[PDB]
Amino acid sequence: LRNARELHRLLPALLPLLDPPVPTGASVCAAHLIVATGHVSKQREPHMSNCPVLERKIPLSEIASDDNFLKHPCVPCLKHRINFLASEDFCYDFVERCGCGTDGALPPEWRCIVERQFGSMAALVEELVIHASNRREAGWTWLVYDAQQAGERPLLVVNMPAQRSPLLLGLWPLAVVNVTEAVLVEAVRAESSGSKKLSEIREKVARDAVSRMNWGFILQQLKKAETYYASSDRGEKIRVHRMKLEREAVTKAMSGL
Amino acid sequence: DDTSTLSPERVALRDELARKSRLVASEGMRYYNIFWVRKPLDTMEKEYYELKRRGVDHGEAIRKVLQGFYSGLAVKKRVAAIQAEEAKLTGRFITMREATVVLGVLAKLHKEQLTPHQVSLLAKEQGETTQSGAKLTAIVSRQVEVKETANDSVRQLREKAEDQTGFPDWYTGESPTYS
Amino acid sequence: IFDGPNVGITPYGGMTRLLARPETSLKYPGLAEFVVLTGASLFAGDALRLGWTDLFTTIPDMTYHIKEWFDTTEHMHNDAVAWQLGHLLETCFKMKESHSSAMERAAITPTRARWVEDAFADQPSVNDIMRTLTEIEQLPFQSTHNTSDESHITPYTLGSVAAGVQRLGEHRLRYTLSPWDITPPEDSVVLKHTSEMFRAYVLERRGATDVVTHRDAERAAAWSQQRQREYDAYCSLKEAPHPRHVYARLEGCEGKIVSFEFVFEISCTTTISRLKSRILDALGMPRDRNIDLGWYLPTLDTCPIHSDEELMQVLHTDPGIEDPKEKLRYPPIYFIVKRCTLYFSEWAYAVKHQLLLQSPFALRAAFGLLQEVRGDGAAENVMPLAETLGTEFKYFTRLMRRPDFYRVGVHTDKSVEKWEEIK
Amino acid sequence: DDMFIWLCHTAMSVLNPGDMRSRLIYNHLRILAESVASGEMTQRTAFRFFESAVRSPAYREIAKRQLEGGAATRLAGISAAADVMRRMGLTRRPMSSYFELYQRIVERSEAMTPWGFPPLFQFEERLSLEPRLKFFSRAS
Amino acid sequence: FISPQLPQMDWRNMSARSSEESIREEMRQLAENDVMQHQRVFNERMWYEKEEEHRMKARSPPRVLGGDYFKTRFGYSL
Amino acid sequence: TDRIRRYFRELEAVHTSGSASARGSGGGTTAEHKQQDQFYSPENQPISLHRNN
Amino acid sequence: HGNLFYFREYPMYPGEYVPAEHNTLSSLRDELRLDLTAQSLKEAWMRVSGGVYFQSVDEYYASVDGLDAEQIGEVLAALFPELNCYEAQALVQRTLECISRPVSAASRQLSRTITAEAVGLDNAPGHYTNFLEWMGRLTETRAFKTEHALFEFSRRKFNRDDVRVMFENYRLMSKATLLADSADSYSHFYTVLKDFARKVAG
Amino acid sequence: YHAYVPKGASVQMGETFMPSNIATAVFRETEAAAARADKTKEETGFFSQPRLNYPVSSGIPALFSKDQFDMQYSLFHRDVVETLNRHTLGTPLEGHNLETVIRKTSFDATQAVAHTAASEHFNYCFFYKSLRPWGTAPPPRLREALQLQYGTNGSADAMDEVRRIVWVTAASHQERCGWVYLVWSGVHFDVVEFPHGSCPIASDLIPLLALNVHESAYILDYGTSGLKQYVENYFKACNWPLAERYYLMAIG
Amino acid sequence: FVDLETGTSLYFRDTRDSAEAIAHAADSKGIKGMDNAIDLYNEYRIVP
Amino acid sequence: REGWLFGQQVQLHYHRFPDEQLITNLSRWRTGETVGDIAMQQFRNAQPFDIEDKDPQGVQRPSPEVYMKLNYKNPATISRFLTRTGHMYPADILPLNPEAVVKLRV
Amino acid sequence: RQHDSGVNQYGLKPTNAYDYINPTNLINFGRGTTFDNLGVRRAGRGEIDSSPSHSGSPVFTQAKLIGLSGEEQLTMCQSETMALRLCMA
Amino acid sequence: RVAFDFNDQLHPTRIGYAWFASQDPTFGH
Amino acid sequence: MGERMRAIIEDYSKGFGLGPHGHSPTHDTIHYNTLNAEGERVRDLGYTDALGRLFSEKLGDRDVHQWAVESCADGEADVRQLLLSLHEWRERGRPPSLLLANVLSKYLEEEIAAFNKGIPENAPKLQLETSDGTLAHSGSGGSRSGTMWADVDPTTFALHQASQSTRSTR
Ligand SMILES: [Mg+2]
Ligand SMILES: [Zn+2]
């Protein structure tokens, strides 16, 4: 669950190599780590010679413990580990926020959006259920917002392989269901306890996870999203960036001349 | 001895069922008969008789049973697609649009007969394309130079992750913090 | 059928022993009292589960096959005999293949076992048994302890509504003409001999070409069209609102008949469910009961009604049969109502309704007999066959003297036509 | 070598020869095979022996609980027929039995009305077919 | 044709296929194609007839009568 | 059926010989094949094998 | 070119049907199907390479002349970055084996054996799939091949050269080699017939 | 009598300890068992779980409790098989080998269900076949092979080194869904980590040993932090001679 | 006959009722009569 | 022993048993050649046509209506049963229900 | 054994009493006769007494069936030859 | 035919199912 | 000659009694050892104790007899006895006599400790305690030595473990 310590030890060795994105600073958000660390090119950063996890000298989970590696870290490895940690505890944190079955008060605006999209709330319940229920692996299932088709389809349900974050696809996470096999197992042995097929119990975990959701949190999330894609600095940044990409196409095309 | 256990009425029934969909007929036995598994033809005949004794007429009972089969199949292949998605963004599985890149390679190799050297070179420059490769590449027509949109790459897959901002933090939504 | 306290006598035939084996007390506690007190039928499945016999078969004309199989056999040495007999048994009578628990015929199917053991198990009298039963009938439909089960539907006579109409139709006189053409046409058809049709063709020129047409064709088209419109009137009118008085008799030992005035609108399934909802409202049951409606025919037959379009036909076909002295505002119909589910309270009501329906002396007697054969209940204390036949004999011999058995109970089970001939 | 032909017939020429794994029918086949080798029986006689051998009471009516048109699956037949030739000492080199029994079937698979045979030419009789046209023969 | 295609970047299109609209559509599609085909391999004759008919076609509630009605009409059955 | 067979023999023929317009010196065919098979023969490109041309 | 006749389709034999989910009329200007099937891949390959078709995988490796599986495996390991090095060659082999027949290799025979015995017995009534597997796996055996050779031999399928080859394969034995290879009751037949067996089977 | 006694029950001697109540409850459980057996006979598909060569009525010695292993066998694996059967019927893959399902479904997203289930079925199988209850000592020839590669100037250094590299590989797969194999590439040994829904046959390697690194495998016994202990125990219980004869068959 | 196990259960059918085969009320404990071997070497020969 | 149709000594068929396509092709099947195989599917159970005259001498020809017009006053309907010369067809060429032959010659 | 049961060492094996009085019947059925050719009464093909029989009368029309070399023979190409003839004229 | 085979059916009894109501409900004609 | 050879052999080598499926080896419809399914089941399992290989690991190279004179000080026990019992336990695999079990217990205690140190609670451990009279290792649950078997016939065991090349026979 909490990786805050292992990442507390790992991060200072990551931050000088991340200064491209931003330099050393007090507070870092798991989201921005996940995205900064997300896709790693074999070409730019390879495994440095005598990579201790390449020859299987040290395990990837224990590279946090030895300090020899912390002095001269192998970028792709350190990255992969940090990405994993940040992503997974992003998941647990997020679930502890959506997983409050406390208030049974259900917002009007949420319904207003959901019926336009799905046609009822039961439709969404069922979407989440069959997406969490039927999985190629035991991961997390996400309900997220995508700005791309957002006029048409505000929301969609992506079940992500293992702990991988949706932020990695440029999707705005709204809510999450935990189907990881720890949950399945403790569910199984919660059933033999008291005062059976896997399919039906993992669907029971799916639809007893859906009933424990806090929709207000999703309201705030969705509003934050819409507000964000509505922001000026978004458009401006896009423009400046694509401008850079054009300058680069031009200068790389001039280089061969 | 060979004499059909099937009475003419049954024959007409499962023959009609079979001709209205080939899937139903083939399901149990495509190649050889798998005889320790139940078969759709049979299950459907069963629930057909079931419908008849609840007073449903011939036509509607048939189309109802067939709808049952088709809806079950709909469930199955929805599941298949739902997992297909996950599996494609896992990175190691492939639909036809990438397979055409594999075939592309095999065909380029055959058409222009290649030395293993030329092959390795191909591999490393295709690795360069695959990773460092850029969208929006420019050709010089001179004065006038035009930029167009290329194939896929990993760097493109980065820039897609940052909302084409060029920055790792765009998410204002609440998340954990580290100090 | 081990009965006969219903004819006012104690059971005979030694099966008492089988019912008292410590095995039966293990598997189905209370079943022994159920079958000995209540005359009640046991079937193949029940005789198999109790381990009364090892062998069961579904094959047609088994006897022929046994014959022809033992024709092909050769020696008499008991090795040979053992194998031939054994192979016969294994290949047919033991159910190795093609057999399921759904398919074997069973009265005591597992909910029923639970009920029996709640009612009849370990009770030291017939009296205790029925104040128990009386207390079970009293349960609401909503209690935890009132448990349901699949009821076996007692089969209808005719099996379908169409069969109902046809069966009803032999006591009636068909009209020469169907309802839509009886009424005279609005045009006038001059009746000719048949032959004058065939001489009615004619030669016209249409467009550029020569054509042979009937001179009367358009007239016949008007005619046939009008008849179709009358058919439409007739059918649309059979769908029109039908205000009839409804009698509904709940099938079971508890006589209850519900009567109410119902309007049938058979144009826009939902109407059948409306009628069933109403029936249940009157019977005092939840509206979620699975209810089989049925048509009680004037011919004393019975149908299921599966559909609204059928129900319309039932209303149209049966005019009703009514005692006019009793004044009903609308024509009656008579439905039978089958329950697809028995509750515990219901079942218990039935079984008490039978226990009250048979001779008390022989009830109490037969209880005494069962508990005398059973003895202690240990594997030793049960009487063997030789003592059981003797005991049953003792009781039978002592009861048969009483006027109850010979003067009354013997003629009890007679058919109806026998009683008619005697009367 | 004609033995393989006989066994081919018992395997492919008989609809529903019971379950051929069962020790009963299996022993029937074994004994008859050893009696076709060593010339103690005619092929025709041993075949009519095989199909008329005692199997199980009410055979057809148990056959209605498995088969539609009375044609069983041919795997049990070939596995048994190879087994018998192996357990009997029929060949010096073990594999040959199975190979030949298999091969002769595969070649006949392509023939028009492959698993039916004219009763006169099917086995030994006064008048015979020329060695090329004989049925499971090596010369086809 | 050796233009690198990454399977991760297709994901949007795959998600379009998890929607029950598109699967309703593949169901209709596959149920229309499931009737028994007598065509076998592509036939020139039938293609020609088909397209010639397409050239020719390019140049181009009431109560349902019940079984009882057709019971009463002897003529109609003839 | 014969049509199909002929279509796919002329296709693969066209690709074996069209490889030469793809690779002149490219190799891809064995050196010994360069020795033995590049000569005119009845299988390769005979003149005519029959009387009355 | 066109036939000598133009007819409609031959009627369909009783019991004969077009297999399920198989598009009978499909043309090359049809849109490419999404999945990977022998059908979809072969139509695809027709569009990509044109008319290049090979009977088996080693024929393809014949046409490319000196390009092994793994060399190409590096090209694909480059293109799809998240694949392994093993899965990259595997991808090649699977594509080639879809376009043509499956390869004949000791490796794949071993894999087959290993799965066959990793599954064990089955719940099939007569142990049906197991007799399937067993009867198949003996087709690839040495002894079976020897028998196939003796059978084609019986039909006079050899020539003089094959014979002199068999002869001088025999002369190479000693009385000792005979005593050892006659133990199997088969393998000496294989020592003599080796080249001829290899000739028929390949 | 074996046929008549239900699947779970053990057939033993009467000690006459049974009060009539529980004695009846038992018969009722048996009746239910007969019913569910009748429906499982018809639910049966083409593929099925493998018969275990060793008794698991108690745990697997030094490795698993009864509940752990039977949560693998009778829970996850049998689900995998139900899935596999659901999706290999009504498809071109009906009634073929486990291989020709694994191999013809390789690397395609459309058939990902079939492929995942298939490969998991294989992995579980090979895992069961890779466990010998009291363990075994690695045979000389295999030790000679391994030593020529992993061994650095030490006696059977290859054994400690192989059971080290396996640990490292296991700890370096973070997702905890998948398998660790010791395999033969055909030119050399190595320890590969397969993700869930992937298999050594799909990548055309030849498997020697399997280790199950799913969290569901070690959770009930070793907890969430107990992976190291888990692997260490696995080697107490593994089966070497199998790996050896597979290796030697691969070579020739 | 003897090799096929089938039908050997039938020598012992008296076992089908446990409390009886202890009690010995019925004299028939065996396939052909009073016991399994009354006359093994005599009876069967009465078939031609 | 003779079959009725052409006197064959066997009953005509193509395939019989469920296994034969499998067992014949078995090595291909273990290999996995046979996965998408449409030859082992299409023709697997395919049997011969029924080549038989359901009417050896047609009692079916003509259909009922025609009889009405087989009288003397329908030259057309006479003509559909004759040759182009007006002669009748021999029985084994164009078989007719005996009623039709009587009515026709009359 | 090494050959047919209906044929012994000296010829066809003589079952009925007609064979013992008339044993020319065993060794000679005509001028297409060889010794392996006894018991197979039909002789090779393209050979004397090679013709198969149908209800006793021999089948001498085979080519006429498939429409090779018959007067009624099937013609492959007509439209072509007619077209070309038209062109010439 | 006035003589009948072992495995051949004998003549049908003419009628000229309603009367099977007591039998197996599924039992056909 | 061959046929009556075969008859004698098949008659003498036939099994009898009831098998694991509760039936005769010759029973009609139901079969044992289908396709050498038991043969393979022995192939992959093999017959060996865990205790056996722990011992053969710790002893290593050095002389068995030397070890026996060591593990007995003068007054401990007859050397012939534990020599006998050791031989009969290692090859000809048997349950070890409580003599040999006591000796091995105080000899191997650290290897058994190390083999036992990681195990979860509900899983089989490895223990030598003879508190119960009998030696049959079907009696302890197979947990006394490392045995997976109730019984293995001596000859087969000896052949199997000698197919492992550890000891010097030649
Ligand atoms: Mg002549
Ligand atoms: Zn690294």
The phi and psi torsions of C226 (rounded to 5 degrees) equal -60, -45
The phi-psi region of residue M142 (left if phi > 0; otherwise alpha if psi is between -120 and 50; otherwise beta) is left
DSSP string, A190-256: HHS-----HHHHHHHHHHHHSTT--HHHHHHHHHHHHHHHT-HHHHHHHHHHHHHHHHHHHHHHHHT
What gap in Å lies between CA A252 and CA G156, rounded to an integer?
A: 72
DSSP class of J19:
T
The CA distances from residue A108 to A175, A219, B72, G109, in Å, are 18, 10, 35, 64
- Nearest 5°: the CA angle C165, C166, C170 is 115
Find the distance separating the first CA and the last CA of chain M, reported in whole Å.
39
* A77 annotated to a ligand binding site: yes
Residue I45, min C-alpha distance to chain D (Å): 23
Hey, what are C180's tokens?
A: 């839509």
Q: How far apart are CA A201 and CA A184, in angstroms?
A: 8
- Mutual orientation of helices C62-72 and C78-88 as an angle, nearest 10°? 150
Of M7, M29, M6, M27, the closest CA to residue M17 belongs to M27
Contact between chains at B21 and E1 (C-beta distance less than 8 A): no
Spell out the SS3 assignment of B42-107.
HHHHHHHHHHHHCCCCHHHHHHHHHHHHHHHHHHHHHHHHHHHHHHHCCCCCECHHHHHHHHHHHH
Check CB contact of D140 with chain C, cutoff 8 Å: no
CA distance B130 to M49: 55
Q: What is the largest CA-CA distance in chain J?
A: 74
- Pairwise CA distance, residues A222 & C99, whole Å: 59
Burial of C80 (0-12, 13-18, 19+ CB in 10 A): middle
Enumerate residues 6+ apart whose C-beta is below 8 A from K15. D126
Torsion (CA) E12, E16, E17, E23 in degrees, nearest 10:
180
- The C-alpha atoms of residue C127 and residue C139 are separated, in whole angstroms, by 19
Burial class for A209, CB neighbours closer than 10 Å (0-12, 13-18, 19+): buried
**Residue C322, Cβ neighbours under 10 Å: how many?**
13
Please, are residues B146 and B139 in contact by the beta-carbon 8 Å criterion?
A: yes
**In the numeric block, which tokens belong to residue I1?**
């006959």
- What angle do the packed helices A198-209 and A181-191 form, to 10 degrees? 100
Q: Note whether I3 contacts D23, CB cutoff 8 Å.
A: yes
H156 close to A (CB below 8 A) = no
What are the start-end ranges of the H helices in G126-159? 128-137, 142-154
Contact A51, A77 (CB under 8 A): yes
What is d(CA H84, CA H75) in angstroms, rounded to the nearest whole number? 14
Q: Which residues contact C209 (CB under 8 A, 6 or more apart)?
A: none
Dmax (CA) for chain D in angstroms is 43
Contact predicate B87/A134, CB 8 Å: no
| Residue closest to E27 by CA, chosen among B149, B81, C75 | B81
CB B21 within 8 A of CB B67: no
Backbone angles phi, psi at B147, to 5 degrees: -110, 135
Instruction: In whole angstroms, give the CA distance from residue C149 to residue C344.
Output: 8
CA-derived radius of gyration, chain G: 24
Say if B92 is an interface residue toward chain G (CB within 8 Å): yes
Structure tokens at J54: 């359901």
Q: Helix, strand or coil for residue M53?
A: helix
What lies within 8 Å, CB to CB, of A143 at 6+ separation is: A128, A155, A156, A157, A174, A175, A176, A177, A218
The rounded Cα H85 to chain-centroid distance in angstroms is 18
DSSP state of C151: P
Residue A45 DSSP symbol: S
Dist. CA C411–CA C418, nearest whole Å: 10
User: What is the DSSP code (8-state) at residue G167?
Assistant: H
C369 C-beta neighbours (distance < 10 Å), count: 24
Ligand nearest to the CA of K53: 1
Answer whether E36 sits within 8 Å of B105, measured CB to CB: no
Q: How many CB atoms lie within 10 A of CB D19?
A: 20
Please choose, from the candidates D2, D16, D77, the residue with its C-alpha nearest in 3D space to the C-alpha of residue D46: D2
- β-pairing, K7-8 with H206-212? unpaired
> Resolution, in Å, please?
3.3
Residue A51 among known ligand-binding residues: yes
Question: Quick one: A53 exposed, middle or buried, by C-beta within 10 A (0-12, 13-18, 19+)?
Answer: buried
Answer whether A35's CB lies under 8 Å from A168's CB: yes
C-alpha closest to that of M71 among M58, M61, M60, M82:
M82
| M-interface mutation test, from D22, D24, D28, D62, most M Cβ less than 10 A away | D22
Whether residue I25 lies within 8 A of chain C, CB to CB, comes out as yes
Residues B98, E6: Cα–Cα separation, whole Å: 7
SS3 (DSSP) at K20 = helix
Residues 122-161 of C with CB under 8 A from B: 160
b/e sequence H6-24, b meaning 16+ C-beta within 10 Å:
eeeeeeeeeeeeeeeeeeb
Helix ranges (H only) for chain H are 20-43, 66-71, 78-88, 98-102, 112-129, 140-147, 157-172, 215-222, 227-237, 240-251
Dump strand ranges (E) for C209-326: 209-214, 242-250, 257-264, 291-296, 302-304
Burial of H242 (0-12, 13-18, 19+ CB in 10 A): buried
Residue with tokens 């490769």: B133
Structure tokens, G141:
């055996």
Spatial distance between the Cα atoms of H203 and G88, rounded to a whole number of angstroms: 8
H or E element, residue A109: helix A108-117
Residue C46: CB atoms within 10 Å = 21
Q: How far apart are CA H94 and CA A195, in angstroms?
A: 45
Burial track F20-52 (b if 16+ CB lie within 10 A, e otherwise): eeeeeebebbeeeeeeeeeeeeeeeeeeeeeee
Residue G83 CB contacts under 8 Å (≥ 6 apart), including other chains: B91, B92, G76, G77, G91
H-M interface: how many C-beta pairs under 8 angstroms? 88
C-beta neighbour count of H125 within 10 angstroms? 20
CA distances from M165 to C327, H143, M161 (A): 108, 12, 8
Which CB contacts under 8 angstroms, 24+ apart, belong to C53-58? C54/C93, C54/C94, C54/I16, C55/C89, C55/C93, C55/C94, C56/C93, C56/C94, C56/C95, C56/C99, C56/C104, C57/C92, C57/C93
As a residue count, chain J comes to 106
Q: Give the Cα separation of H24 and F12 in Å (integer).
A: 78
Determine contact, residues K22/K15, Cβ cutoff 8 Å. Answer: no
Q: List the structure tokens of E45.
A: 């004759």
Q: State in Å: Cα D112 to ligand 1 middle.
A: 30
Identify the residue whose tokens are 């050899």.
Answer: G158
Identify the burial level of J65 via C-beta atoms within 10 angstroms of its C-beta, where 0-12 means exposed, 13-18 middle and 19 or more buried.
exposed
Element (H, E) at A176: strand A172-178
Distance CA J18, CA J20 (A): 6
For residues C360 and C161, the answer to whether their CB atoms sit within 8 Å is no
From chain A, the residues in CB contact with H195 under 8 A are 137
Q: Which is nearest to M144 in space by CA: M109, M96, M111? A: M96
User: F11-14 long-range contacts, Cβ below 8 Å, gap at least 24?
Assistant: F11/G50, F11/G51, F11/G52, F11/G53, F12/G51, F12/G52, F12/G53, F14/G51
Please give the C-alpha separations between residue H108 and each of H84, I47, J5, K57, in angstroms, as whole numbers: 16, 73, 54, 64
Helix (H) or strand (E) holding M50: helix M50-58
CA–CA gap between residue G86 and residue H205 (Å, rounded): 8
- Token pair for C164: 């109902």
Q: What separation in Å is there between the alpha carbon of A47 and the centre of ligand 2?
A: 4
Q: What angle do CA B152, B158, B160 make, to 5 degrees?
A: 75
Instruction: Tell me which chain M residues have a C-beta less than 8 angstroms from the C-beta of D37.
Output: none
Identify the experimental approach: cryo-EM
Q: DSSP code of K58? A: E
Length, in residues, of chain G: 202
**SS3 for C337?**
strand
Q: Are strands B145-148 and B137-140 parallel, antiparallel or unpaired?
A: antiparallel
Strand-strand pairing, C332-339 and C242-250: parallel
| Pair type for strands C332-339 and A155-160 | unpaired
Q: Which residues in chain B have their CB less than 8 angstroms from residue C304's CB?
A: 55
How far, CA to CA in Å, does G83 sit from each of C243, G74, H102?
Answer: 76, 11, 17
The number of beta carbons lying within 10 Å of the beta carbon of residue B177 is: 13
Instruction: Give CA separation, M26 vs B63, C159, I13, in Å.
Output: 53, 53, 22
Do the chains contact at M44 and H242, CB–CB below 8 Å? yes
Catalogue the E-assigned strands of K1-89. 7-8, 11-12, 53-54, 57-58
Listing DSSP states for B110-152 in one string gives HHTT--HHHHHHHHHHHHHHHHH--SSEEEE----EEEE----
Contact call for residues C150 and C341 (beta carbons, < 8 A): yes
CB contact under 8 A, G82 and B96: no
Nearest Cα of chain E lies from the Cα of B87 at a distance, in angstroms, of 9
Count CA atoms within 13 Å of residue C189 on its CB side.
Answer: 16
Please identify which residue in the block is written with the tokens 């025999």. G170
Q: What are phi and psi of H79, to 5 degrees?
A: -65, -45
Three-state SS for G186?
A: coil
